Design a protein around this ligand. Structure first.
Ligand SMILES: O=C(CCCCCCC(=O)C(F)(F)F)Nc1ccccc1
Ligand SMILES: [K+]
Ligand SMILES: [K+]
Ligand SMILES: [Zn+2]
Length: 367
Protein backbone atom coordinates (compact mmCIF):
# COMPACT_ATOMS: atom_id res chain seq x y z
CA UNK A 1 0.00 0.00 0.00
CA UNK A 2 1.49 3.27 -1.36
CA UNK A 3 -0.14 6.59 -0.46
CA UNK A 4 -0.49 9.45 -2.93
CA UNK A 5 -1.54 13.00 -2.25
CA UNK A 6 -2.69 15.53 -4.88
CA UNK A 7 -5.14 18.36 -4.12
CA UNK A 8 -6.64 20.39 -7.00
CA UNK A 9 -5.57 23.58 -5.28
CA UNK A 10 -1.90 22.62 -5.60
CA UNK A 11 -2.40 23.42 -9.29
CA UNK A 12 -4.02 26.79 -8.49
CA UNK A 13 -1.02 28.54 -6.83
CA UNK A 14 -0.90 32.14 -8.17
CA UNK A 15 2.69 32.91 -9.27
CA UNK A 16 1.86 36.30 -10.86
CA UNK A 17 2.83 37.79 -14.25
CA UNK A 18 6.65 37.92 -13.87
CA UNK A 19 9.34 35.35 -14.81
CA UNK A 20 10.91 35.10 -11.36
CA UNK A 21 10.62 38.56 -9.83
CA UNK A 22 7.49 40.51 -10.72
CA UNK A 23 7.06 41.96 -14.24
CA UNK A 24 8.82 45.30 -14.05
CA UNK A 25 8.34 48.13 -16.50
CA UNK A 26 11.34 50.33 -15.58
CA UNK A 27 13.63 47.26 -15.82
CA UNK A 28 11.76 46.40 -19.10
CA UNK A 29 10.90 42.92 -17.86
CA UNK A 30 7.92 42.08 -20.08
CA UNK A 31 4.94 40.31 -18.47
CA UNK A 32 4.74 36.64 -19.31
CA UNK A 33 1.92 34.10 -18.99
CA UNK A 34 4.12 31.37 -17.33
CA UNK A 35 6.43 32.32 -14.42
CA UNK A 36 9.32 29.85 -14.00
CA UNK A 37 7.49 28.29 -11.00
CA UNK A 38 4.07 28.09 -12.72
CA UNK A 39 1.94 25.24 -11.20
CA UNK A 40 1.35 23.56 -14.63
CA UNK A 41 4.71 21.77 -14.31
CA UNK A 42 3.57 19.83 -11.19
CA UNK A 43 -0.03 19.41 -12.48
CA UNK A 44 1.44 17.63 -15.57
CA UNK A 45 3.21 15.23 -13.21
CA UNK A 46 -0.18 14.44 -11.55
CA UNK A 47 -1.95 14.02 -14.93
CA UNK A 48 0.86 11.67 -16.08
CA UNK A 49 0.47 9.66 -12.83
CA UNK A 50 -3.22 9.31 -13.81
CA UNK A 51 -3.01 8.83 -17.61
CA UNK A 52 -0.21 6.24 -17.32
CA UNK A 53 -2.38 3.97 -15.15
CA UNK A 54 0.04 4.36 -12.24
CA UNK A 55 -2.81 5.82 -10.12
CA UNK A 56 -4.45 2.35 -10.22
CA UNK A 57 -1.61 1.12 -7.99
CA UNK A 58 -1.80 4.03 -5.54
CA UNK A 59 -3.98 4.70 -2.49
CA UNK A 60 -5.20 8.33 -2.77
CA UNK A 61 -4.77 10.23 0.50
CA UNK A 62 -6.85 13.40 0.92
CA UNK A 63 -4.81 16.43 2.19
CA UNK A 64 -5.82 17.91 5.60
CA UNK A 65 -5.04 21.61 6.25
CA UNK A 66 -2.04 22.01 8.57
CA UNK A 67 -3.33 23.64 11.76
CA UNK A 68 -1.64 26.64 13.43
CA UNK A 69 -0.23 24.09 15.93
CA UNK A 70 1.32 21.99 13.08
CA UNK A 71 2.94 25.02 11.50
CA UNK A 72 4.36 26.24 14.83
CA UNK A 73 6.38 23.00 15.26
CA UNK A 74 8.57 24.36 12.44
CA UNK A 75 7.90 28.14 12.26
CA UNK A 76 7.67 31.22 14.47
CA UNK A 77 4.38 32.86 15.45
CA UNK A 78 5.52 36.01 13.63
CA UNK A 79 6.06 34.03 10.42
CA UNK A 80 2.55 32.53 10.55
CA UNK A 81 0.85 35.88 11.23
CA UNK A 82 2.78 37.57 8.45
CA UNK A 83 1.53 34.87 6.05
CA UNK A 84 -2.05 35.37 7.27
CA UNK A 85 -1.54 39.12 6.72
CA UNK A 86 -0.23 38.72 3.15
CA UNK A 87 -2.95 36.21 2.26
CA UNK A 88 -5.65 38.76 3.24
CA UNK A 89 -4.57 41.15 0.47
CA UNK A 90 -7.04 41.76 -2.45
CA UNK A 91 -4.58 40.27 -4.94
CA UNK A 92 -2.28 38.93 -2.19
CA UNK A 93 1.40 39.72 -2.70
CA UNK A 94 5.10 39.23 -2.07
CA UNK A 95 5.96 37.45 1.19
CA UNK A 96 9.25 39.30 1.81
CA UNK A 97 11.98 38.19 -0.61
CA UNK A 98 10.69 39.61 -3.92
CA UNK A 99 10.27 36.27 -5.72
CA UNK A 100 7.77 34.51 -3.43
CA UNK A 101 4.21 35.59 -4.01
CA UNK A 102 1.08 34.38 -2.31
CA UNK A 103 -2.20 35.00 -4.12
CA UNK A 104 -5.25 36.21 -2.25
CA UNK A 105 -6.35 33.48 0.24
CA UNK A 106 -3.12 31.64 -0.76
CA UNK A 107 -2.60 30.57 2.88
CA UNK A 108 -5.29 27.88 2.33
CA UNK A 109 -3.05 26.20 -0.29
CA UNK A 110 0.11 26.58 1.90
CA UNK A 111 -1.78 24.77 4.74
CA UNK A 112 -3.01 22.00 2.36
CA UNK A 113 0.55 21.51 1.06
CA UNK A 114 2.14 21.19 4.51
CA UNK A 115 -0.96 19.24 5.57
CA UNK A 116 -0.64 16.76 2.66
CA UNK A 117 2.89 15.95 3.92
CA UNK A 118 1.56 15.55 7.52
CA UNK A 119 -1.37 13.27 6.54
CA UNK A 120 0.83 11.08 4.40
CA UNK A 121 3.38 10.91 7.23
CA UNK A 122 0.69 9.98 9.79
CA UNK A 123 -0.73 7.07 7.72
CA UNK A 124 2.71 5.62 6.94
CA UNK A 125 3.83 5.84 10.63
CA UNK A 126 0.59 4.17 11.63
CA UNK A 127 1.33 1.15 9.35
CA UNK A 128 -1.72 1.81 7.14
CA UNK A 129 0.64 2.67 4.28
CA UNK A 130 4.18 1.33 3.81
CA UNK A 131 5.28 4.49 1.94
CA UNK A 132 3.96 7.41 -0.15
CA UNK A 133 4.46 10.43 -2.46
CA UNK A 134 2.84 13.79 -1.54
CA UNK A 135 2.76 15.88 -4.77
CA UNK A 136 2.32 19.14 -2.86
CA UNK A 137 2.59 22.78 -4.01
CA UNK A 138 3.79 25.36 -2.84
CA UNK A 139 7.23 23.73 -2.08
CA UNK A 140 8.89 23.99 1.32
CA UNK A 141 12.64 23.56 1.71
CA UNK A 142 13.83 27.20 1.45
CA UNK A 143 11.49 28.44 4.20
CA UNK A 144 13.46 28.81 7.48
CA UNK A 145 11.92 29.07 10.99
CA UNK A 146 11.08 32.80 10.55
CA UNK A 147 10.54 33.43 6.83
CA UNK A 148 9.04 32.55 3.46
CA UNK A 149 11.78 32.15 0.88
CA UNK A 150 12.31 31.00 -2.72
CA UNK A 151 8.65 30.05 -3.55
CA UNK A 152 8.25 28.38 -0.14
CA UNK A 153 5.65 29.61 2.36
CA UNK A 154 6.06 26.83 4.96
CA UNK A 155 8.60 24.10 5.25
CA UNK A 156 6.45 21.07 4.35
CA UNK A 157 8.97 18.37 5.27
CA UNK A 158 9.81 20.14 8.60
CA UNK A 159 6.13 20.45 9.48
CA UNK A 160 5.93 16.68 8.83
CA UNK A 161 9.11 15.89 10.81
CA UNK A 162 7.84 18.10 13.69
CA UNK A 163 4.60 16.09 13.69
CA UNK A 164 6.51 12.77 13.61
CA UNK A 165 8.60 14.00 16.57
CA UNK A 166 5.92 15.63 18.84
CA UNK A 167 2.74 13.67 17.97
CA UNK A 168 3.98 10.25 16.85
CA UNK A 169 6.77 10.09 19.46
CA UNK A 170 9.61 9.36 17.00
CA UNK A 171 13.08 10.03 18.40
CA UNK A 172 14.96 10.42 15.12
CA UNK A 173 13.82 11.62 11.70
CA UNK A 174 15.92 12.12 8.54
CA UNK A 175 15.20 14.69 5.85
CA UNK A 176 17.00 13.95 2.57
CA UNK A 177 16.68 16.85 0.07
CA UNK A 178 17.72 16.18 -3.53
CA UNK A 179 16.07 19.24 -5.02
CA UNK A 180 18.97 20.84 -6.90
CA UNK A 181 18.92 23.91 -4.61
CA UNK A 182 20.25 24.11 -1.06
CA UNK A 183 17.66 23.28 1.57
CA UNK A 184 18.58 26.33 3.71
CA UNK A 185 15.20 26.51 5.42
CA UNK A 186 15.29 22.90 6.63
CA UNK A 187 18.94 23.35 7.73
CA UNK A 188 17.88 26.46 9.69
CA UNK A 189 14.91 24.88 11.46
CA UNK A 190 16.71 21.77 12.73
CA UNK A 191 20.18 23.44 13.10
CA UNK A 192 20.52 22.97 16.84
CA UNK A 193 18.56 19.71 16.97
CA UNK A 194 20.19 16.22 16.66
CA UNK A 195 16.77 14.56 16.53
CA UNK A 196 16.33 15.54 12.87
CA UNK A 197 19.19 14.79 10.47
CA UNK A 198 19.12 17.10 7.44
CA UNK A 199 20.94 16.12 4.25
CA UNK A 200 21.03 18.33 1.18
CA UNK A 201 22.54 17.48 -2.22
CA UNK A 202 22.69 20.61 -4.38
CA UNK A 203 24.47 22.53 -7.11
CA UNK A 204 27.08 24.61 -5.22
CA UNK A 205 25.92 28.26 -4.80
CA UNK A 206 22.91 27.86 -7.11
CA UNK A 207 20.26 28.96 -4.64
CA UNK A 208 20.38 30.53 -2.09
CA UNK A 209 23.54 32.56 -2.74
CA UNK A 210 26.40 32.10 -0.24
CA UNK A 211 24.74 29.02 1.29
CA UNK A 212 25.14 25.22 1.49
CA UNK A 213 28.89 24.91 2.12
CA UNK A 214 29.99 21.57 3.70
CA UNK A 215 31.18 23.54 6.79
CA UNK A 216 27.51 24.21 7.68
CA UNK A 217 27.17 21.31 10.06
CA UNK A 218 24.64 22.30 12.66
CA UNK A 219 25.38 23.80 16.08
CA UNK A 220 25.18 22.78 19.72
CA UNK A 221 23.65 19.38 20.30
CA UNK A 222 22.83 19.44 16.57
CA UNK A 223 26.47 19.81 15.44
CA UNK A 224 27.16 16.91 13.03
CA UNK A 225 23.54 16.41 12.06
CA UNK A 226 23.42 18.79 9.11
CA UNK A 227 25.13 17.38 5.94
CA UNK A 228 25.59 19.50 2.80
CA UNK A 229 26.85 17.90 -0.42
CA UNK A 230 27.53 20.83 -2.80
CA UNK A 231 28.23 19.53 -6.34
CA UNK A 232 29.68 21.33 -9.37
CA UNK A 233 27.47 22.48 -12.28
CA UNK A 234 27.30 19.79 -14.93
CA UNK A 235 27.00 16.89 -12.44
CA UNK A 236 24.82 14.01 -13.67
CA UNK A 237 23.74 10.47 -12.79
CA UNK A 238 27.26 9.24 -11.99
CA UNK A 239 27.91 12.05 -9.48
CA UNK A 240 24.52 11.76 -7.79
CA UNK A 241 24.80 7.95 -7.41
CA UNK A 242 28.38 8.19 -6.14
CA UNK A 243 27.08 10.70 -3.55
CA UNK A 244 24.23 8.32 -2.57
CA UNK A 245 26.51 5.31 -2.00
CA UNK A 246 29.46 7.17 -0.48
CA UNK A 247 27.66 9.79 1.67
CA UNK A 248 23.83 9.64 1.90
CA UNK A 249 23.24 5.93 2.56
CA UNK A 250 26.10 5.66 5.12
CA UNK A 251 24.78 8.83 6.92
CA UNK A 252 21.30 7.28 7.09
CA UNK A 253 22.66 3.91 8.29
CA UNK A 254 24.81 5.68 10.95
CA UNK A 255 21.88 7.79 12.07
CA UNK A 256 19.17 5.13 12.27
CA UNK A 257 16.13 7.36 11.78
CA UNK A 258 12.65 5.95 12.40
CA UNK A 259 11.30 7.76 9.31
CA UNK A 260 12.96 8.97 6.10
CA UNK A 261 11.34 12.00 4.45
CA UNK A 262 12.57 12.87 0.94
CA UNK A 263 12.44 16.52 -0.20
CA UNK A 264 11.94 15.37 -3.76
CA UNK A 265 12.73 18.02 -6.39
CA UNK A 266 13.47 17.26 -10.06
CA UNK A 267 15.28 20.50 -10.90
CA UNK A 268 18.60 18.60 -11.12
CA UNK A 269 17.19 17.25 -14.39
CA UNK A 270 19.04 17.54 -17.66
CA UNK A 271 16.42 19.94 -19.07
CA UNK A 272 15.79 22.25 -16.09
CA UNK A 273 16.18 26.03 -16.60
CA UNK A 274 16.91 26.79 -12.85
CA UNK A 275 20.05 24.68 -12.60
CA UNK A 276 22.91 23.17 -14.68
CA UNK A 277 22.83 19.52 -13.61
CA UNK A 278 22.41 16.51 -15.89
CA UNK A 279 20.23 13.97 -14.00
CA UNK A 280 17.81 11.97 -16.17
CA UNK A 281 14.66 10.09 -15.14
CA UNK A 282 16.83 6.95 -14.70
CA UNK A 283 19.13 8.89 -12.33
CA UNK A 284 16.09 9.77 -10.16
CA UNK A 285 14.78 6.15 -10.37
CA UNK A 286 18.19 4.85 -9.16
CA UNK A 287 18.30 7.46 -6.33
CA UNK A 288 14.69 6.54 -5.27
CA UNK A 289 15.49 2.78 -5.50
CA UNK A 290 18.60 3.07 -3.22
CA UNK A 291 16.78 5.30 -0.63
CA UNK A 292 13.64 3.05 -0.52
CA UNK A 293 15.85 -0.07 -0.16
CA UNK A 294 17.79 1.78 2.58
CA UNK A 295 14.51 2.62 4.38
CA UNK A 296 13.41 -1.06 4.08
CA UNK A 297 16.59 -2.09 5.87
CA UNK A 298 16.78 0.47 8.66
CA UNK A 299 13.26 1.76 9.40
CA UNK A 300 10.84 -0.97 8.25
CA UNK A 301 10.39 0.87 4.89
CA UNK A 302 8.89 4.08 6.38
CA UNK A 303 9.63 6.62 3.64
CA UNK A 304 7.58 9.65 2.60
CA UNK A 305 8.41 11.58 -0.60
CA UNK A 306 7.29 15.21 -0.62
CA UNK A 307 7.41 17.36 -3.76
CA UNK A 308 9.97 20.19 -3.89
CA UNK A 309 11.11 22.00 -7.12
CA UNK A 310 11.57 21.26 -10.83
CA UNK A 311 10.78 23.56 -13.74
CA UNK A 312 10.66 21.48 -16.93
CA UNK A 313 6.99 20.97 -17.82
CA UNK A 314 8.21 18.70 -20.65
CA UNK A 315 10.51 16.42 -18.63
CA UNK A 316 9.61 16.66 -14.86
CA UNK A 317 6.51 14.44 -15.26
CA UNK A 318 8.67 11.49 -16.44
CA UNK A 319 11.28 12.07 -13.71
CA UNK A 320 8.47 12.11 -11.18
CA UNK A 321 6.69 9.05 -12.61
CA UNK A 322 10.00 7.13 -12.36
CA UNK A 323 10.10 7.71 -8.61
CA UNK A 324 6.45 6.67 -8.12
CA UNK A 325 7.10 3.53 -10.24
CA UNK A 326 9.91 2.67 -7.75
CA UNK A 327 7.44 3.02 -4.86
CA UNK A 328 4.71 0.85 -6.38
CA UNK A 329 7.06 -1.62 -8.09
CA UNK A 330 4.84 -1.31 -11.18
CA UNK A 331 6.35 -0.01 -14.38
CA UNK A 332 3.92 2.09 -16.52
CA UNK A 333 5.99 3.78 -19.24
CA UNK A 334 9.47 4.19 -20.73
CA UNK A 335 11.19 7.61 -20.59
CA UNK A 336 10.44 8.88 -24.13
CA UNK A 337 13.41 11.29 -23.84
CA UNK A 338 15.90 8.54 -22.94
CA UNK A 339 17.71 8.04 -26.26
CA UNK A 340 17.80 11.84 -26.80
CA UNK A 341 19.43 12.67 -23.41
CA UNK A 342 21.65 9.55 -23.22
CA UNK A 343 24.42 10.79 -25.49
CA UNK A 344 24.72 14.11 -23.67
CA UNK A 345 26.91 12.90 -20.77
CA UNK A 346 26.77 13.16 -16.97
CA UNK A 347 27.15 9.36 -16.71
CA UNK A 348 30.88 9.52 -15.95
CA UNK A 349 32.18 10.56 -12.56
CA UNK A 350 34.50 13.48 -13.25
CA UNK A 351 37.52 14.13 -10.99
CA UNK A 352 36.05 17.40 -9.63
CA UNK A 353 32.72 15.66 -8.88
CA UNK A 354 34.63 12.95 -6.98
CA UNK A 355 36.68 15.56 -5.01
CA UNK A 356 33.45 17.40 -4.02
CA UNK A 357 31.93 14.14 -2.68
CA UNK A 358 35.15 12.98 -0.97
CA UNK A 359 35.15 16.24 1.09
CA UNK A 360 32.00 15.03 2.95
CA UNK A 361 33.16 11.49 3.78
CA UNK A 362 35.08 12.46 6.99
CA UNK A 363 31.85 14.06 8.30
CA UNK A 364 30.19 10.62 8.55
CA UNK A 365 32.29 9.78 11.68
CA UNK A 366 30.52 12.39 13.82
CA UNK A 367 26.98 10.93 13.37
O1 LIG B 1 17.85 32.88 -7.28
C1 LIG B 1 16.68 33.28 -7.34
C2 LIG B 1 15.61 32.27 -7.84
C3 LIG B 1 15.26 31.25 -6.74
C4 LIG B 1 15.23 29.80 -7.19
C5 LIG B 1 14.08 29.11 -6.44
C6 LIG B 1 14.35 27.63 -6.13
C7 LIG B 1 13.10 27.12 -5.43
C8 LIG B 1 12.85 25.60 -5.45
O2 LIG B 1 13.33 24.84 -6.29
C9 LIG B 1 11.85 25.07 -4.43
F1 LIG B 1 10.70 25.36 -5.02
F2 LIG B 1 11.88 25.65 -3.23
F3 LIG B 1 11.83 23.77 -4.29
N1 LIG B 1 16.29 34.53 -6.99
C10 LIG B 1 17.12 35.52 -6.53
C11 LIG B 1 18.17 35.26 -5.62
C12 LIG B 1 19.02 36.28 -5.15
C13 LIG B 1 18.82 37.59 -5.60
C14 LIG B 1 17.77 37.86 -6.50
C15 LIG B 1 16.93 36.84 -6.96
K1 LIG C 1 18.89 20.06 -2.05
K1 LIG D 1 19.49 18.66 12.82
ZN1 LIG E 1 14.72 23.75 -6.36
Amino acid sequence: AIGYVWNTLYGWVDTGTGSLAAANLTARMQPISHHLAHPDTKRRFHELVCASGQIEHLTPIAAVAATDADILRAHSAAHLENMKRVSNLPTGGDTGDGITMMGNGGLEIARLSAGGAVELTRRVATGELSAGYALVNPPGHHAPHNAAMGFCIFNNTSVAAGYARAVLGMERVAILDWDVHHGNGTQDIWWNDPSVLTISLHQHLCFPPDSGYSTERGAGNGHGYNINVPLPPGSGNAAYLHAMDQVVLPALRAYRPQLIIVGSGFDASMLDPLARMMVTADGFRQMARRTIDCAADICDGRIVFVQEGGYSPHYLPFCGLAVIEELTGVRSLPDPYHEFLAGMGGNTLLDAERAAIEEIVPLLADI
